Scaffold this motif. Structure first.
Motif, PDB file in Angstrom:
ATOM      1  N   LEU A 160       0.893  -0.893  -0.106  1.00 55.86           N
ATOM      2  CA  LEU A 160       0.122  -0.147  -0.321  1.00 55.86           C
ATOM      3  C   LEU A 160       0.462   1.231   0.058  1.00 55.86           C
ATOM      4  O   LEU A 160       0.325   2.412   0.381  1.00 55.86           O
ATOM      5  CB  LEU A 160      -0.275   0.016   0.920  1.00 55.86           C
ATOM      6  N   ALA A 161       2.251   1.280  -0.138  1.00 58.16           N
ATOM      7  CA  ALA A 161       2.956   2.826  -0.140  1.00 58.16           C
ATOM      8  C   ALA A 161       2.758   3.336  -1.446  1.00 58.16           C
ATOM      9  O   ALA A 161       1.943   2.474  -2.610  1.00 58.16           O
ATOM     10  CB  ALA A 161       4.162   1.691  -0.128  1.00 58.16           C
ATOM     11  N   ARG A 162       3.306   4.957  -1.184  1.00 62.60           N
ATOM     12  CA  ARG A 162       3.208   5.456  -1.860  1.00 62.60           C
ATOM     13  C   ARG A 162       3.704   6.721  -1.922  1.00 62.60           C
ATOM     14  O   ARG A 162       4.902   6.603  -0.315  1.00 62.60           O
ATOM     15  CB  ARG A 162       1.312   6.393  -1.572  1.00 62.60           C
ATOM     16  N   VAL A 163       4.260   7.725  -2.838  1.00 64.60           N
ATOM     17  CA  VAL A 163       5.247   8.174  -2.477  1.00 64.60           C
ATOM     18  C   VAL A 163       4.049   9.537  -2.538  1.00 64.60           C
ATOM     19  O   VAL A 163       3.333   9.699  -2.403  1.00 64.60           O
ATOM     20  CB  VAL A 163       5.423   8.647  -4.650  1.00 64.60           C
ATOM     21  N   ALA A 164       5.134  10.344  -1.285  1.00 65.88           N
ATOM     22  CA  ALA A 164       4.193  11.437  -0.697  1.00 65.88           C
ATOM     23  C   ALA A 164       3.919  12.290  -1.524  1.00 65.88           C
ATOM     24  O   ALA A 164       4.550  12.788  -2.681  1.00 65.88           O
ATOM     25  CB  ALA A 164       5.206  11.965   0.329  1.00 65.88           C
ATOM     26  N   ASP A 165       2.405  12.983  -1.338  1.00 63.09           N
ATOM     27  CA  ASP A 165       2.034  14.742  -2.338  1.00 63.09           C
ATOM     28  C   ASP A 165       1.129  14.838  -1.153  1.00 63.09           C
ATOM     29  O   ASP A 165      -0.007  15.094  -1.953  1.00 63.09           O
ATOM     30  CB  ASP A 165       1.473  13.358  -3.475  1.00 63.09           C
ATOM     31  N   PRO A 166       1.454  15.843  -0.708  1.00 62.95           N
ATOM     32  CA  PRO A 166       1.636  16.758   0.200  1.00 62.95           C
ATOM     33  C   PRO A 166      -0.041  17.667  -0.546  1.00 62.95           C
ATOM     34  O   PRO A 166      -1.046  18.008   0.421  1.00 62.95           O
ATOM     35  CB  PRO A 166       2.586  17.910   0.757  1.00 62.95           C
ATOM     36  N   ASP A 167       0.966  17.681  -1.648  1.00 64.01           N
ATOM     37  CA  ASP A 167      -0.596  19.241  -2.335  1.00 64.01           C
ATOM     38  C   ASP A 167      -1.753  18.542  -2.673  1.00 64.01           C
ATOM     39  O   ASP A 167      -2.632  18.797  -3.413  1.00 64.01           O
ATOM     40  CB  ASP A 167       0.893  19.548  -3.662  1.00 64.01           C
ATOM     41  N   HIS A 168      -1.931  17.189  -2.967  1.00 65.00           N
ATOM     42  CA  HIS A 168      -2.458  16.983  -3.511  1.00 65.00           C
ATOM     43  C   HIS A 168      -3.334  15.518  -2.114  1.00 65.00           C
ATOM     44  O   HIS A 168      -4.142  14.557  -2.548  1.00 65.00           O
ATOM     45  CB  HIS A 168      -2.843  15.181  -4.615  1.00 65.00           C
ATOM     46  N   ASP A 169      -3.342  15.922  -0.961  1.00 63.18           N
ATOM     47  CA  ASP A 169      -4.068  15.167  -0.182  1.00 63.18           C
ATOM     48  C   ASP A 169      -5.483  15.169   0.446  1.00 63.18           C
ATOM     49  O   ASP A 169      -5.940  15.185   0.967  1.00 63.18           O
ATOM     50  CB  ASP A 169      -2.819  15.476   1.734  1.00 63.18           C
ATOM     51  N   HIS A 170      -5.833  17.129   0.286  1.00 65.40           N
ATOM     52  CA  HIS A 170      -6.977  17.045   0.378  1.00 65.40           C
ATOM     53  C   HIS A 170      -8.286  16.272   0.099  1.00 65.40           C
ATOM     54  O   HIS A 170      -8.016  15.905  -1.179  1.00 65.40           O
ATOM     55  CB  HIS A 170      -7.484  18.463   0.483  1.00 65.40           C
ATOM     56  N   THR A 171      -9.440  15.541   0.276  1.00 65.56           N
ATOM     57  CA  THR A 171     -10.615  15.446  -0.461  1.00 65.56           C
ATOM     58  C   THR A 171     -11.757  15.791   0.835  1.00 65.56           C
ATOM     59  O   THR A 171     -11.254  16.612   1.973  1.00 65.56           O
ATOM     60  CB  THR A 171     -10.254  13.635  -0.068  1.00 65.56           C
ATOM     61  N   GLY A 172     -12.717  15.408   0.407  1.00 65.18           N
ATOM     62  CA  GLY A 172     -14.245  15.035   1.804  1.00 65.18           C
ATOM     63  C   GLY A 172     -14.227  14.064   2.354  1.00 65.18           C
ATOM     64  O   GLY A 172     -13.275  13.429   2.842  1.00 65.18           O
ATOM     65  N   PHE A 173     -15.776  14.358   3.075  1.00 66.35           N
ATOM     66  CA  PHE A 173     -15.818  13.940   4.275  1.00 66.35           C
ATOM     67  C   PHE A 173     -16.230  12.328   4.419  1.00 66.35           C
ATOM     68  O   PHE A 173     -16.440  12.432   3.184  1.00 66.35           O
ATOM     69  CB  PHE A 173     -16.708  14.706   5.455  1.00 66.35           C
ATOM     70  N   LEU A 174     -15.397  11.684   5.172  1.00 62.60           N
ATOM     71  CA  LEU A 174     -15.898   9.962   4.752  1.00 62.60           C
ATOM     72  C   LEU A 174     -15.446   9.694   3.530  1.00 62.60           C
ATOM     73  O   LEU A 174     -16.402   8.234   2.855  1.00 62.60           O
ATOM     74  CB  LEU A 174     -17.400   9.452   5.305  1.00 62.60           C
ATOM     75  N   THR A 175     -14.301   9.793   2.945  1.00 62.33           N
ATOM     76  CA  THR A 175     -14.115   9.232   1.693  1.00 62.33           C
ATOM     77  C   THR A 175     -13.416   7.900   2.272  1.00 62.33           C
ATOM     78  O   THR A 175     -12.457   7.805   3.107  1.00 62.33           O
ATOM     79  CB  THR A 175     -12.733  10.081   1.319  1.00 62.33           C
ATOM     80  N   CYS A 244      -8.304  24.556  11.078  1.00 66.69           N
ATOM     81  CA  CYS A 244      -7.511  23.479  10.301  1.00 66.69           C
ATOM     82  C   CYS A 244      -8.333  23.101   9.130  1.00 66.69           C
ATOM     83  O   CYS A 244      -7.591  22.790   8.097  1.00 66.69           O
ATOM     84  CB  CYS A 244      -6.482  22.952  10.405  1.00 66.69           C
ATOM     85  N   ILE A 245      -9.413  22.402   9.553  1.00 66.49           N
ATOM     86  CA  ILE A 245     -10.306  21.914   8.530  1.00 66.49           C
ATOM     87  C   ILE A 245     -11.319  22.914   7.891  1.00 66.49           C
ATOM     88  O   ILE A 245     -12.155  22.787   8.445  1.00 66.49           O
ATOM     89  CB  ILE A 245     -10.864  20.696   9.229  1.00 66.49           C
ATOM     90  N   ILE A 246     -11.374  22.897   6.523  1.00 70.44           N
ATOM     91  CA  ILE A 246     -12.078  24.140   6.053  1.00 70.44           C
ATOM     92  C   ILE A 246     -13.485  23.163   5.262  1.00 70.44           C
ATOM     93  O   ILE A 246     -14.126  23.857   5.305  1.00 70.44           O
ATOM     94  CB  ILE A 246     -11.322  24.700   5.335  1.00 70.44           C
ATOM     95  N   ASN A 247     -13.232  21.569   5.143  1.00 69.30           N
ATOM     96  CA  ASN A 247     -14.220  21.406   4.947  1.00 69.30           C
ATOM     97  C   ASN A 247     -15.545  21.453   4.977  1.00 69.30           C
ATOM     98  O   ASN A 247     -15.457  20.738   6.762  1.00 69.30           O
ATOM     99  CB  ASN A 247     -14.181  19.819   4.394  1.00 69.30           C
ATOM    100  N   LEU A 248     -16.242  21.422   5.830  1.00 65.65           N
ATOM    101  CA  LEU A 248     -18.001  22.253   5.933  1.00 65.65           C
ATOM    102  C   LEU A 248     -18.217  20.728   6.659  1.00 65.65           C
ATOM    103  O   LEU A 248     -18.469  20.647   7.574  1.00 65.65           O
ATOM    104  CB  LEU A 248     -19.003  22.664   5.132  1.00 65.65           C
ATOM    105  N   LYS A 249     -18.672  19.803   5.716  1.00 64.03           N
ATOM    106  CA  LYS A 249     -19.591  18.629   6.647  1.00 64.03           C
ATOM    107  C   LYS A 249     -18.144  17.932   7.250  1.00 64.03           C
ATOM    108  O   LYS A 249     -18.802  17.253   8.289  1.00 64.03           O
ATOM    109  CB  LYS A 249     -19.228  17.726   4.669  1.00 64.03           C
ATOM    110  N   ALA A 250     -17.082  17.755   7.089  1.00 66.31           N
ATOM    111  CA  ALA A 250     -16.036  17.498   8.338  1.00 66.31           C
ATOM    112  C   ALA A 250     -16.171  17.901   9.686  1.00 66.31           C
ATOM    113  O   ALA A 250     -16.633  18.180  11.031  1.00 66.31           O
ATOM    114  CB  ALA A 250     -14.544  17.240   8.029  1.00 66.31           C
ATOM    115  N   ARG A 251     -15.736  18.871   9.460  1.00 64.57           N
ATOM    116  CA  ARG A 251     -16.043  20.271  10.841  1.00 64.57           C
ATOM    117  C   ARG A 251     -17.371  20.269  11.304  1.00 64.57           C
ATOM    118  O   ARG A 251     -17.769  20.664  12.669  1.00 64.57           O
ATOM    119  CB  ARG A 251     -16.133  21.785  10.675  1.00 64.57           C
ATOM    120  N   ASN A 252     -18.303  20.352  10.793  1.00 65.14           N
ATOM    121  CA  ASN A 252     -20.047  20.359  11.313  1.00 65.14           C
ATOM    122  C   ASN A 252     -20.313  18.723  11.478  1.00 65.14           C
ATOM    123  O   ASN A 252     -21.151  19.264  13.163  1.00 65.14           O
ATOM    124  CB  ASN A 252     -20.593  20.639  10.065  1.00 65.14           C
ATOM    125  N   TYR A 253     -19.621  18.249  11.483  1.00 67.04           N
ATOM    126  CA  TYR A 253     -20.076  16.723  12.036  1.00 67.04           C
ATOM    127  C   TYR A 253     -19.017  17.012  13.368  1.00 67.04           C
ATOM    128  O   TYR A 253     -19.442  16.772  14.470  1.00 67.04           O
ATOM    129  CB  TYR A 253     -19.111  15.450  11.380  1.00 67.04           C
TER     130      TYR A 253
END
Ligand SMILES: Nc1nc(N)n(-c2ccccc2)n1
Length: 346
Positions: A160-175, A244-253
């Motif tokens: 399951l290893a991957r090359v690090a990619d901080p710039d593309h780390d963001h996603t939505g809630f419950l991914t 730090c959590i800007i996604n609304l679904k995650a923050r409001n949960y």
């Protein structure tokens, strides 16, 4: 060919006296006597070519393990396969035989503080090298930490290893996420794909906690329950960490949950060394940006007996996949595995 518990295990002249050891996350594992070096080794049969997914995990692991060379990372000693692509149905990976893993040890044995310290040092020493190559393991857990009869530790399973990619780390809630639930960092459930190094340090913190108590610290039974377990111990996150959590679904949960106060580690682990607890606290930090990095962890007073940066090597270059891999067909992946394993052929 040699036969084992209802299966072809044709590993040829060099390896004999086959004995079933178990199932790893690929296929069947056997121990065998290596007639050239005169030692017993472990051999994993992989049959991946009827699944694009298995081929991808297999190739990724082969490539990584062949490039890495480190005392605390399992190596590949030999790879056995047919001489032609048309005849190649299976691949056999040969590795040093290890006595046990940390999972089996924790089921059955109480660890001394000296063992805990030594094991933790070796995990972080191997992790320093992995992270220096810009690679994330992403599935660190006790089952993936092998030990020999003298307590030397090796990290395994780079599927399951991957090359690090901080710039593309963001996603939505419950991914959706693939790595083992109890060792997943909280951000995976909220806003992260697990493409940064802080994912691995969380898993090491979970492992430390488990070494202290012999049981998993966050044994969630399903995706969301994993979070409620974390928050019951760490407490509700601060306003600053929520910001730090800007996604609304995650923050409001998170804002919908009742208040939970922190449970101090010394109440959970009254026998533990206080220095171990201080390091644990820094690994199991809710905000990944405030989480300790591997090199800071090695320099922590808990590990002072072992810390020696001149004997804690880094990789000679960052690691990179030449081809993407993720969008390749079965047929192509077969050809690539054939090509990567060529160097072990007479
Ligand atoms: N290298 C090595 N040594 C053992 N025992 N290994 C093993 C790993 C997973 C399942 C069974 C055996 N792997």
């Amino acid at each position: 060919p040699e036969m084992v518990r209802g299966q072809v295990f044709d590993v040829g002249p060099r390896y004999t006296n086959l004995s079933y050891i178990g199932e790893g996350a690929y296929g069947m594992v056997c121990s065998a006597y290596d007639n050239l070096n005169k030692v017993r080794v472990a051999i994993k049969k992989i049959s991946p070519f009827e699944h694009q997914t298995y081929c991808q995990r297999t190739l990724r692991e082969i490539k990584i393990l062949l490039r890495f060379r480190h005392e605390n990372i399992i190596g590949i000693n030999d790879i056995i396969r047919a001489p032609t692509i048309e005849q190649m149905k299976d691949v056999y990976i040969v590795q040093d035989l290890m006595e046990t893993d940390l999972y089996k040890l924790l089921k059955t044995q109480h660890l001394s503080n000296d063992h805990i310290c030594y094991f933790l040092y070796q995990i972080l020493r191997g992790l320093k090298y992995i992270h220096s190559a810009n690679v994330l393991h992403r599935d660190l857990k006790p089952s993936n930490l092998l030990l020999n009869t003298t307590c030397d530790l090796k990290i395994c399973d780079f599927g399951l290893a991957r090359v690090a990619d901080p710039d593309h780390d963001h996603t939505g809630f419950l991914t959706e996420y693939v790595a083992t639930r109890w060792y997943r960092a909280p951000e995976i459930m909220l806003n992260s794909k697990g493409y940064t190094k802080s994912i691995d340090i969380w898993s090491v913190g979970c492992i430390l906690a488990e070494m202290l108590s012999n049981r998993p610290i966050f044994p969630g039974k399903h995706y969301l329950d994993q979070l409620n377990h974390i928050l019951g111990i760490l407490g509700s996150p601060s306003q600053e960490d929520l910001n730090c959590i800007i996604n609304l679904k995650a923050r409001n949960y998170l804002l919908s949950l009742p208040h939970k106060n922190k449970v101090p580690w010394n109440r959970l682990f009254p026998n533990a060394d206080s220095k171990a607890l201080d390091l644990l606290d820094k690994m199991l930090t809710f905000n990944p940006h405030k989480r300790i990095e591997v090199e800071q962890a090695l320099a922590h007073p808990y590990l002072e007996q072992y810390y020696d940066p001149s004997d804690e090597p880094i990789a000679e270059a960052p690691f990179k996949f030449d081809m993407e891999l993720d969008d390749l067909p079965k047929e192509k992946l077969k050809e690539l595995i054939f090509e990567e394993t060529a160097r072990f052929q007479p």
